[PDB]
Symmetry: D3
């Protein structure tokens, strides 16, 4: 193996330069299966890698696990192997009252509520998505007719306090995040998730193209805890970026 | 007058909701003149405002002056009068050796090296341009055939130390900014300018649409201190983008 | 022209080493006219420059525009031309209930709510005025008998949120500045304006002398939006600093 | 299921209040197997959970995945199910030349180079391990005779730049971390790993007991990129400490 | 004299490598007097130094004065003289309702609300006590049967605002610390004092062993202003560390 | 006693509203003895307090010890007992080559390299002296004849690494302060000391008047440790100035 964590070699990728990067290892095979000649390559820790073919070109599907840190490992090591384009596909909680469960959200840029992004660029640097990737994602969503929102995402190193959840062991939120959800809504932020800030920052600051799309599984103006269109979209976007 | 600085009334705008915002008051009339029925509205401090017409729709052209603070006054007060879309047109100096004088830069988001943006959103919030504005700008540029770069801009509160210029009175740069250009360079940042961080942050965090386009007048990989046809390209592009956003 | 923005040459200055720097280009000629042999030198963007003579010495009057960034340009380029002493004359909003519209405020040092000052010295460095300049201004005010307050000024990169104005398009103020006016008042801060923090920091940290005086045009304990003694004072101070 | 990520119920735990939290799901079963009556409970994402028994008391073994964020999910949700003591077992790379591959490191507190800990307590709050857990870990180490170091650990959100690795795609490290390893080295810091800052801070600030132990697999004073008997030592140590904290 | 402030020579120490460091100069002799052959060595500014003998080994008692800054001088200069182990003995205000006046508090690590610690290590570095020292203190306290709490301490550069006291000349507390005591209680912090952050950080980051114990003189859930078990404990702990 | 640390009552002050505040408890009596009717009030920890009379008015002299934190206690407690003007008197080491041993420094404001000032106002607030105090100090200096420098002082919570000293147990300086002395020098900072940032910030933000003067006893840019005797005399010079300044502020 050529990389320390993923257990992959340059050769396993077979010239692939695009990766769809879901968070959950168990959803890797599922995404791969929507393409041609899906093949499992490796599985170590939270990193599960499949290779498939899309319009006759090799494409990687590799899971990041939850969070900036493991994402930063996946992305670095895939880049070493030759990946230049990363499409992230996630689940997310919407924080605006007009976004519905099942809606698709495309992130133009992220509020950096993470630690890992600071390891690539200082805070003033925008966690901005690649324009071609964003365009591909928006356009893909248009063509499958999914209801889509485009805008800014709050990207948090935690699922609980950083997203201002109060149903927790302690029931408290640190001073810094008390009242934070409401500030982000006032600023038009669409949703919370946990990886985009890292992904976008590490890519934007290293010449790698990244885009970001998520399916809404809960609306935070209703509920803290949650009770496929996006997967179709990310694959179709990959198709346009090949 | 309905606003404190611009010396304009809601009426003067005639239902305009889009503004082209150059930095220089003297450049305002030139831009308005590319459109129909250009009329001077007002001129106070660095804020010169003309109204014109584009495919029969009223459009504002308004100068920001240099820097976030004055930009923030013009944007706020325009927003009060009904503007909802802001297209910035500028000059800039590239910091990438592949970008040439004459090229056009469309900013997706900015490195926030300014003070005003912090007055609208904390630092972690992205100084990101509106997707539709960026699209219109990129498409306008394609349509007139300019060689174009799309990416990140470093937006500084100073022309000198914040852009790591050493050829100054003191000849020196504060510790924080020493070696900073080389860092932005490695991170793929295209250029320095002085207003976008404020503009993009204040718009993105208040439901206002903003976009940024600039023509390259100098390249820092050869010179610190700094062609008329280059800003003619950029102006043409911004006006054409306005057309698509109406 | 010897400088990139002001369109002036060393020669235009005629040995001048002192500049009165108002914010508004339209008030430059007005100030120059209080001195002898006033002459327009240049006008570019927000930078309008006149030269005049005071007790037989050449003096510059040059506008900064609104805000640290354009101020930093004017001051840098005037320094390059040989100016060593900067007197700022502005308009301001008082935030103490006992300071009246028409009162003259002399800044000893500023609360740095700007970005540009950080490009000259880190935050811990005081935005302090020069002692000779402050003395001149205080003494000038005494001799024309204007009612004067001497003390600390909050210098803000914005006119709206940074000065906690709520009559705005959005009607909100970012968390950081919510309740900030009241903190500054409790701390004895006299007023808000937008340039001193930049001016004072850039000069104090480069061996340039700077002083700062403003006429109060609104009292913020009453109003957000506003409805010449100071000009006389700045000129008279210049006279003592020659 | 009672918790959103782990896929467990309060019942599955059978009154367990202590959890051993390795990073790697694949290591969970190995650890459980050193105890009595090991049973797989659940496996979702990077979270694999086994239950076992230690001196007749139920004990949880549950993987965190790599990094503070997923760690914080595991710990929060385990806390919701009744766990009050967390023992982390890891692999690490030492940055002191006197610490050898094979040595065991017990962390008293961590340099907080992570994002998640800030979600529980501001930066000035110490990422400090629980005194009893640290004592149990040190005593367990002594009892099996491993050569042990007790001290401060640097806990980074990245494996690469945050640990000042240059042998990467870009070959560069952000200004903030340039020269950082030499600083931690001078300050007596033993090693880099990626979870403890989050773990220790979130437990220390919520009345939960946490401890940290790792086996040294590589030494940075010779190599960036990286024996089976070393982690066998550390695992033996963590289980024995668990025994003493029951 | 070998050091700039303490007026001591290597030789005065007679091979001592452990120092008990109280805050108050007047309490130095008192502590020394609990050991054998107590001898006054020096007295300059807030730094009073006695030497005594404990189980036939020389031991220093040296006062730090109040606050990180003077502490940092004492510790640095003692270290130059050969001290490698520092045991702090202080008075403190408890902020948990269950901790009583007279109780003994052993600090595992401190919330760094001081300035001096940042001069040794950046804020992300833990103000953690040495494990052997903490063990010695805890065990000492067990053996003399004093009622003891072990945990985190908030260490503040001020006695008034940084500990959220309101009975002051001004009666205000700066925004940053408004509501701070309650946050620290929620987080399990036991108490306020003023030196541990500096001591623990400067020691932990230079290979010096440090421990921290204090007797509770006020409970802040009742009172702002206050109306020997700890001294016995620090001495006994020194004994175990020799 | 009316205050927790100083062991003073409002009555002890006899209506005093000005205090001279040196660093060292042992210099308090010496300063007070320059004035009339000097009397010891109290002595607890590093806080020694004498009262004297200047042109018929009662005046306090009170030591702060070293550093923001204790200064903060003394100023607060003095303020509660009715003090409204604080004059800091010290000795210091210059970092500018033109400033000589023997010179006198009046500080207009300080670089805040301390912790305690943040407990009073956020970092952006200037650690600035009161204008009347600074004027009185500069004018006192001019009247007794000192060669005076007026400007910015760097106020540090440590004597060693924060002042960039490498002659230490560890011989190293934290990243933040590495190369910092050269930066302050380039920015015209006159000297380092250890209390002004706290004092000036806590006063300027609470309607208290503060000022500071110091004699130069050493210069970091030259070699040349002067002398025990030249240090004693420079110190007397500066004390003479603060007292004379106190006169003008009464
Ligand atoms: O409300 C929600 C729903 C989903 N996620 C994300 C991204 C992360 O990997 C994982 C946590 O459930 O899914 C959230 O952060 N918040
Ligand atoms: O190198 C350059 C060229 C242009 N500008 C910008 C934006 C600002 O208003 C003005 C200064 O020349 O133009 C720069 O900042 N840097
Ligand atoms: O309340 C007020 C009145 C005036 N100004 C200032 C300085 C700036 O250039 C311009 C904006 O009105 O005037 C303020 O900041 N606040
Ligand atoms: O040099 C090393 C060796 C191991 N780890 C850790 C903790 C993290 O979960 C995972 C990454 O390899 O192992 C490091 O961070 N750095
Ligand atoms: O509530 C209290 C009681 C005592 N001390 C401390 C430590 C410092 O040296 C001195 C100041 O009173 O005593 C406090 O900080 N807070
Ligand atoms: K993970
Ligand atoms: K301007
Ligand atoms: K002290």
């Amino acid at each position: 193996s050529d990389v320390f964590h993923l257990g992959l070699t340059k050769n396993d990728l077979q010239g692939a330069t695009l990766a769809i990067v879901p968070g959950d290892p168990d959803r890797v095979e599922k995404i791969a299966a929507l393409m041609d000649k899906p093949v499992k390559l490796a599985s170590h820790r939270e990193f599960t890698t499949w290779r498939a073919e899309l319009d006759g070109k090799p494409v990687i599907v590799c899971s990041t696990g939850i969070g900036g840190p493991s994402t930063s490992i996946a992305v670095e090591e895939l880049a070493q192997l030759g990946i230049r384009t990363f499409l992230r596909i996630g689940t997310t909680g919407a924080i605006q009252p007009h976004i519905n469960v099942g809606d698709v959200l495309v992130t133009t840029a992220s509020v950096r509520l993470d630690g890992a992004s600071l390891h690539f660029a200082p805070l003033e640097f925008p966690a901005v998505a690649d324009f071609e990737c964003t365009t591909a994602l928006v356009e893909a969503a248009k063509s499958i007719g999914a209801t889509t929102h485009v805008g800014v995402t709050a990207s948090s190193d935690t699922f609980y306090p950083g997203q201002e959840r109060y149903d927790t062991y302690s029931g408290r939120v640190v001073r810094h995040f008390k009242g934070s959800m409401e500030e982000w809504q006032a600023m038009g932020v669409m949703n919370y998730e946990m990886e985009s800030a890292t992904l976008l920052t590490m890519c934007a600051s290293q010449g790698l193209r990244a885009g970001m799309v998520a399916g809404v599984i809960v609306n935070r103006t209703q509920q803290e805890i949650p009770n496929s269109h996006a997967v179709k979209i990310v694959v179709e976007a990959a198709r346009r970026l090949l």
